[model samples]
Target: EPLDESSVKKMILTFEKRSYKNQELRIKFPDNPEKFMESELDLNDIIQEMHVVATMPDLYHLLVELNAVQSLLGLLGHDNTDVSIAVVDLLQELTDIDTLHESEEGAEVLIDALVDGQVVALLVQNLERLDESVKEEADGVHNTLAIVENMAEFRPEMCTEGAQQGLLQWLLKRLKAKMPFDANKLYCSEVLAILLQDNDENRELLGELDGIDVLLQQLSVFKRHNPSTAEEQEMMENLFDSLCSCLMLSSNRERFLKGEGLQLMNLMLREKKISRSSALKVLDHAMIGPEGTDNCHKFVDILGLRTIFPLFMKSPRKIKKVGTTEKEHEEHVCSILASLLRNLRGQQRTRLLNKFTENDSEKVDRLMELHFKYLGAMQVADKKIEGEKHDMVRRGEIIDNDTEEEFYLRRLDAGLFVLQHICYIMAEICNANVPQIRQRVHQILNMRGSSIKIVRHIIKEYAENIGDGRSPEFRENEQKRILGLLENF
Candidate 1:
């Protein structure tokens, strides 16, 4: 009685009958809402009752076999938006990942049928006719995104397929829609983030569509004012994430540059708001590795050094108010400085090195201060890890490759990554051979009771892992450069 095949067949029969009647009546009496209204209600009632199909994904093939999936896709663009909204509701439940995982074969067959039926195209079409001002329609919009989210989770490979079906363009349009921030808008930002994450095709498509501008324009609102609520803050973070993913594509980085993204991020850093933390994250993404060379030079030209060096001397106390860790702030700031050192050229390069020589080499002091801070954190992590390994070996377990990799990752999680960046920065400055910088660096090592030998060992570890998406030639040269620094030190 719950949901047997015979009852499912009967239900599909009723749905087909009611759907045909509704369409016939609507076409016959196009201007007469009352004429087709009852038939429309019957259709919605059946669709709502069909929600039971979700609980038994094993029966999903029936939905596709009886051509009910086609009916649902057809109804997605019904003359009455009400019917379309109901279809979205039903599909949202049917594609729920929890149920979909119950029967993999059923999920695949049904998903394939939906794809062949071009479900995303139909959904986008339905979305175009939706009036979010109406409460029901707004919920419909939310559910539509839910369906996409569910499908993408069930079949991640379908993301690029969905994007090609106009979903990406519609998301951009909705994100930049002229309306006050609401749950649906927040949902839009979330969906966009999902689409852009780890998909270069979607990232390239977004760039071609000028999505960088839309993201920057939307995010620009928070430059001066913080998100008024936690939900709004989530949307802000999602946009930042999407921006970061898009920057992975070199083309989108160019787009970001042309959009004056550097200027906006620099302004946010100075603004000292909730957005400042995420802006720092975005800057880190925008300006790392060889791809970030232009942004690096642009940042320095914009006087970014003035803004970044202050934060380097001291992490902001207000970061805690916005739920950002002091470590996160320091990490991003250190990363930016490292990138500047690696990428800046000529006059800009000279200007950056001279910062260390100013104020009686106070910046050098700060650099060494952070070096010891994170180095201490790293030592504690290593001690704990050694204890865990000792216990593992006492139990007569051989530490496999995976276990060693896990231990390494634990070290990274425990501030080893940040410590490496700090040490790398130290090596770069000392290698500059400004005599003063070299002299001051040695001076700090002696005063702090930390020898150049210890720093040299740390930099050697840092050099072994310098292949961050760069060519072999570049990596080899970089290792040599760091070694030269160590030799001179």
Candidate 2:
């Protein structure tokens, strides 16, 4: 229905009156204006009305009013969950604009509301309730948590002491209770991920909460249970992915792998039921180094390549039995293997490569050939999906293979790209001089035909890519290392 002139006038009048009332309420009942305002008008109803107004471009000026801002915060105390949710939704929309760009005061005011203990408590309470009935409510809660987390990032000291003390615990409890629901699990994981920012205090709190154990347990469950339903699988994937991010955060990596955390992850990886891809993910997260350091080699030593190598040889075939997505799974597995191979250079890498080649010659050739085929498929797949020439491809740009078959195969093959880079790095480290790189290049060449040659080829090709500057520096190092290994051989 079109809005008549009278309705427009009435809306303007109602808005103006509410604005005036808000100002008077602040002045008249400064200490507890929300209480005073609610006595006459239901705060929830006012919040609903404001939500409609907040979304309108015409009422944009109204949101800038101090009273309007306070009213929204006041709605945080409203008993009606819908009202509280809507007001948060409205605030999220309004503050999304850096409209307060020039107003430091305005930004401060917004941050204060986000970091408020009472506000967080109210939001968490409502979020917990919503988690039980509607799954998507978790996403709404995640947005709100993101807002608060950002505030904590910029102004850590401003976050209410109470909020800082209890927020992590509250989120954890809610997650534990909502475990059966995947979306809720993901929401909980994401919220925790954000809240457990790189700050020392939050990291300490996360440790105290046994956060790593919780995440590892979830990984174990997902690896073992093998969700019977799509929803379950999705939830497991979400949980795992979120946990991976959290584990990947530099601040958490050391503590996460130090004591019990490392042991738990290792246990999960050892489980026969855990897919090769999943185990690799857990290891990948665990092995991520600090800003300037490399620790993947240490991770392999501790986790035992003897155990992990067999999985790589077994992954392509094992994954094939699972479903159409096998190619993608194989890609993840191969990527992990490629990373492992590149990180362990010198005598360590050579010994491990030889051991695997000697024990599983057929598997080694098949795996390398499979990986190579997938790489070729991915290059073609990227061109078709992006509808552009392969020459136009940017570094690290993903090419989607439309079908699961194409997508997975392409991704699986993508690992070779990384392997190629690692080989270059290895060559640089070992050869120092170009002659040494050339002399030992045969070990890499031999891998092309022999079992050892296949493994070496994976390293050499990856190294060449890295040397060409098409891959990362680490790959170049792996290339040099592989070259060094050949010289020694």
Candidate 3:
């Protein structure tokens, strides 16, 4: 029970003389699913000793030299699933796979050996044997996948290791398989999302695996959907997350195009009862780069413009004294339209305007309308603190607010993001449509009744209110465009 120094010496000697066993763990494993391995007594000791070595990293290299990593890899496929779990738990602890303590070079080296040894292959082999239909069995699968992520998260290069090991391929099957949204499904989807996340090779493998099609099928359940239970909500969220991750990769985008993702995306976008947030996320990813350029063209061909611009043309400037509930709703919507606009080009670009007014003249009117309304809101908010030296204005800085002031300030914050979106859209439309650009310079706004310029009013009231929290280069560039329009006049 105490330090088994003599026993440790004998075990180390046995390991020193041992040759690395070249075998599939499945072969030597007992035929009976329930049989305990003959090596369990010895394994229990070696496994318990792993925790001691975990604390003393100085000793791990000896385990490495003794080829202990290979034994543990083999043990992962043990006939007795409990032994399999025990060995995995031991490996996880020894590697400090949780924190990945930086001081422990020895732990990392052994994990490197595990990765290079293709432990993932053995894990894949074990996948069929562990039936997660039983709750107890699911825990083992969770631990097994845990090791995959512990390494996958830190080592982008090892993605091919998991991919070639059939990890992603296996996950595709699990994600496609019919089952409850139990622990295994949740964890597997999570790991799949992470695995799909930053690796170029894995993205390609996911594309080849028909991953997008699988993701969409799962997401389709949420079409015109809600979570009767939080369990349902969380499950759909994980499914959405994985879908989002794959969509981010260009290769997956190609797969999405072939998969008829455009039809599915538009379907979700129009489905009022479905999770619009989740669907918008999928659309955002599809619109990212050159691949996105393709999606934009395909989108307009499907008549996506009619579905979109009617919403975009509505007041970004809110008139309602709405509570917290409504903000993110509108935020996601505006952002979704902006994301689509980023990919709009040539004829696809043509779709955005002609829809605006007879001449795209309506956007300027809306921006001016927003400018005055928000300037009034800003004035009301300013007046509340204007005379008191702003209560806490000891440093000559603007004081923070009371409840009403904070609400209006929040309203002002919302107004700013919306106004910026308006100006941003205006700037983009002007560049694309020469008439709108020319029209804006020649014709001035009726600030009250007299003609004042659009740009300086923008700079003075709205642009001046743009706090530095926004990206300076972006704000400055967008500001210059509006101001540039005025300087031309």
lDDT of 2 by residue, 303-339 (tens): 5565565655565444444352554455445545555
Tell me which of candidates 2 and 3 scores higher on TM-score: 3
Q: Measured by TM-score, how close is model 1 to the native structure?
A: 0.89
Each model's TM-score, in the order given?
A: 0.89, 0.58, 0.68
C-alpha lDDT of residue 324 in model 3 = 23
Can you write out model 1's per-residue Cα lDDT over 378-443, one digit (the tens) per residue?
888889888888999899887899988999987777777778888888888877878877787778
Candidate 3 weakest ten by summed lDDT: 16-25
- Give lDDT for model 1: 0.86
lDDT of 3 by residue, 1-489 (tens): 344533544565554333122132335654667333444545555566555655542445566666777767766766567667777666656544434555456656666788877888888887767874565567767777887767776565777778888888888898898876666777788788778676667777787777889988887777765766766667777787777777767677778888888787678778744465566667766875455778877878898876665544462324333222333444444544555565677876776666655445665565455545555655565565455555546666655456456655655564555554444445555555467644662354443442444434544544454434346876676556455544434
Largest lDDT belongs to which candidate?
A: 1
Off by over 4 Å in 1: 1-6, 17-37, 97-101, 394-405, 446-489
Error (Å) of candidate 2 at residue 188 is: 2.5
Query: Model 1 Cα displacement at 323 (Å)?
Result: 1.4
